[PDB]
Write an enzyme that holds these catalytic residues in place. Structure first.
Site, PDB file in Angstrom:
ATOM      1  N   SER A  45       0.774  -0.558   0.002  1.00 46.43           N
ATOM      2  CA  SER A  45      -0.042  -0.059  -0.176  1.00 46.43           C
ATOM      3  C   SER A  45       1.001   1.340   0.060  1.00 46.43           C
ATOM      4  CB  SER A  45      -0.521  -0.006   1.257  1.00 46.43           C
ATOM      5  OG  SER A  45      -2.053  -0.568   0.943  1.00 46.43           O
ATOM      6  N   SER A  46       0.592   1.876  -0.696  1.00 48.45           N
ATOM      7  CA  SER A  46       1.061   3.278  -0.929  1.00 48.45           C
ATOM      8  C   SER A  46       2.809   3.281  -1.123  1.00 48.45           C
ATOM      9  CB  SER A  46       1.252   4.857   0.526  1.00 48.45           C
ATOM     10  OG  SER A  46       1.913   5.918   0.393  1.00 48.45           O
ATOM     11  N   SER A  47       3.697   3.966  -0.278  1.00 48.60           N
ATOM     12  CA  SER A  47       4.876   3.475  -0.624  1.00 48.60           C
ATOM     13  C   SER A  47       5.430   2.094  -1.172  1.00 48.60           C
ATOM     14  CB  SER A  47       5.863   3.675   0.197  1.00 48.60           C
ATOM     15  OG  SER A  47       6.971   4.259  -0.308  1.00 48.60           O
ATOM     16  N   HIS A  55      -6.146   8.207  -0.749  1.00 44.97           N
ATOM     17  CA  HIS A  55      -5.523   7.508   0.078  1.00 44.97           C
ATOM     18  C   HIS A  55      -5.579   6.448   1.017  1.00 44.97           C
ATOM     19  CE1 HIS A  55      -0.786   7.185  -0.932  1.00 44.97           C
ATOM     20  NE2 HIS A  55      -0.766   6.751  -0.374  1.00 44.97           N
TER      21      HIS A  55
END
Ligand SMILES: *[C@@H]1O[C@H](CO)[C@@H](O[C@@H]2O[C@H](CO)[C@@H](O)[C@H](O)[C@H]2NC(C)=O)[C@H](O)[C@H]1NC(C)=O
Ligand SMILES: *[C@@H]1O[C@H](CO)[C@@H](O[C@@H]2O[C@H](CO)[C@@H](O)[C@H](O)[C@H]2NC(C)=O)[C@H](O)[C@H]1NC(C)=O
Ligand code: NA
Ligand code: NA
Ligand code: NA
Ligand code: NA
EC number: 3.1.1.72
Lengths: 274, 274
Positions: free
Chosen positions: A117-119, A258
């Site tokens: 997730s994300s990074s 996000h």
């Protein structure tokens, strides 16, 4: 079962941490899910905040949670070292966690998956381009395309604002060439990609959804402009699933920011456990 | 720059031996060649009687020499255990030698190859079918198709005379079904196959060459009757190379018996080291 830290899993010059959850109901020949955390997080943190350890008690796979060594907890998805096969960066360390686990537990190498997730989603795309040989499938929750966080001065763990703000827009061909160069001349199998992104993401703005789907379309030789199918309100209301083929689908979540919430049961389906 | 026995490489209920040659000129990210010996032989014997250790000093890969546990030194290529992915037979043991070596030496899992002569060539076909996920390419020196040595009573290490005499003849479709059944449902990466056989082999009759090429043609979706290319006197006089596609070529050696001698430099080229 328990979450254990593993400290000697192979070459690791960037000092990434490794944690594994080995379920009580370990299969005879277990699969592997690599689940990669977001900025400010850690591997144990993602263990605490994802369904994989629970699902592993059903399906008997091992879960690997890599842990960022960097202040701020983001992943290096910008340096040459991390963006090249055998380049020795964070991504190489994650690859070594996989192969350590396969041997130590007799895990099935044909059943190894990667998600984040994300990074960690950015890193998921990078793992898919740098170590395609390791992974049957991957699920990306709100990331950027492989090499979108490229640093033009070889910075390690550098945030690329142009990319995050959705200012980097180019062709499937160009993105594919970028992914291909991460393992130059590789022509073997690549993980099937599933890309989730939300339409009101104000961290990694939604253009990155399209750039990522362009990339994998270009990699697998799909016509980006001509998907096979589009499924409305799949897997739920206000998500739309676009299928380009067996190796690529995108899921765009209208009204979601996000990050897109992990859909654990859907992950199990895409990977093939369920 | 020595040959070492390795004893704890993972599950090994049939007690196969594992020997490895680690070259002095070891590559940073070494490939792996699994070299599988003939009846009456052993792993160290094949080390002494093949060019792979010499070549590992040029190209820096590690060589794994599995060693049959059985009286008579042939491989189990007949039992259900050896003929099934994760079945626990000799083939499963060889798989575990691979994964142990990947992790222990930081070997590149995209650069793992398997080759063998006679009984070891039979096992090469079996490894391709049972652990396709491990192998980028394989070279078969005078073997029989995967499942040609099937035992109708589930015998371990049973010689099948009907097969060896060249009396088992069937279709690409049927051989492909036999190969598919060794890992049912698998649809990922499989090794590119290169099959050598001699026209005057009276141990493993040359019909087995055609049965093997049929098998892999069926597996890869190639038209067995319409190969892509034929090459006279390739790799040498009286050898003829037929390319069915990227994942299958056959090399028929007129006037050569059991076995076709190893062409080590040609193996390097097929594998991609050269
Ligand atoms: C941030 O990311 C982008 C890619 O998302 C980088 O853009 C590449 O930059 C080089 C020049 O340095 C160009 O030749 C490429 O064509 C660009 N790629 C694409 C796909 O546009 C950019 O350099 C990065 N910026 C910083 C400051 O590092
Ligand atoms: C020797 O090997 C052959 C395969 O090469 C076996 O043949 C199979 O036999 C079963 C019946 O047991 C048939 O249903 C299959 O159709 C056969 N396969 C093929 C490709 O013909 C044979 O059984 C083996 N013989 C012994 C004594 O074990
Ligand atoms: Na096992
Ligand atoms: Na978890
Ligand atoms: Na693989
Ligand atoms: Na390395």
């Amino acid at each position: 079962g328990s979450l254990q830290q593993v400290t000697d899993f192979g070459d690791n010059p960037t000092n990434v941490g490794m944690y594994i959850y080995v379920p009580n109901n370990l299969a005879s020949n277990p699969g592997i899910v690599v689940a990669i955390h977001y900025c400010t997080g850690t591997g144990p943190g993602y263990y605490g905040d994802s369904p994989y350890a629970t699902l592993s008690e059903q399906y008997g796979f091992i879960v690997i949670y890599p842990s960022s060594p960097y202040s701020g907890g983001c992943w290096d998805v910008s340096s040459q070292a991390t963006l090249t096969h055998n380049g020795g960066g964070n991504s190489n360390s994650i690859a070594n966690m996989v192969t350590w686990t396969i041997s130590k537990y007799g895990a099935d190498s044909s059943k190894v998956f990667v998600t984040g997730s994300s990074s960690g989603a950015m890193m998921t795309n990078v793992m898919a381009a740098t170590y395609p040989e390791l992974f049957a499938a991957a699920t990306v929750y709100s990331g950027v395309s492989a090499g979108c966080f490229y640093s033009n001065t070889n910075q390690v763990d550098g945030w690329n604002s142009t990319c995050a703000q959705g200012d980097v827009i180019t062709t499937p061909e160009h993105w594919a060439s970028i992914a291909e160069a991460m393992y130059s001349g590789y022509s073997g199998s690549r993980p099937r990609m599933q890309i989730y992104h939300g339409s009101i993401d104000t961290t990694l703005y939604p253009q990155n959804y399209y750039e990522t789907c362009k990339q994998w379309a270009g990699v697998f030789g799909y016509d980006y402009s001509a998907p096979e199918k589009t499924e409305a309100n799949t897997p739920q209301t206000n998500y739309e699933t676009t299928i380009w083929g067996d190796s690529l689908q995108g899921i765009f979540a209208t009204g979601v920011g996000h990050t897109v919430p992990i859909h654990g049961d859907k992950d199990m389906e895409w990977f093939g456990f369920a």
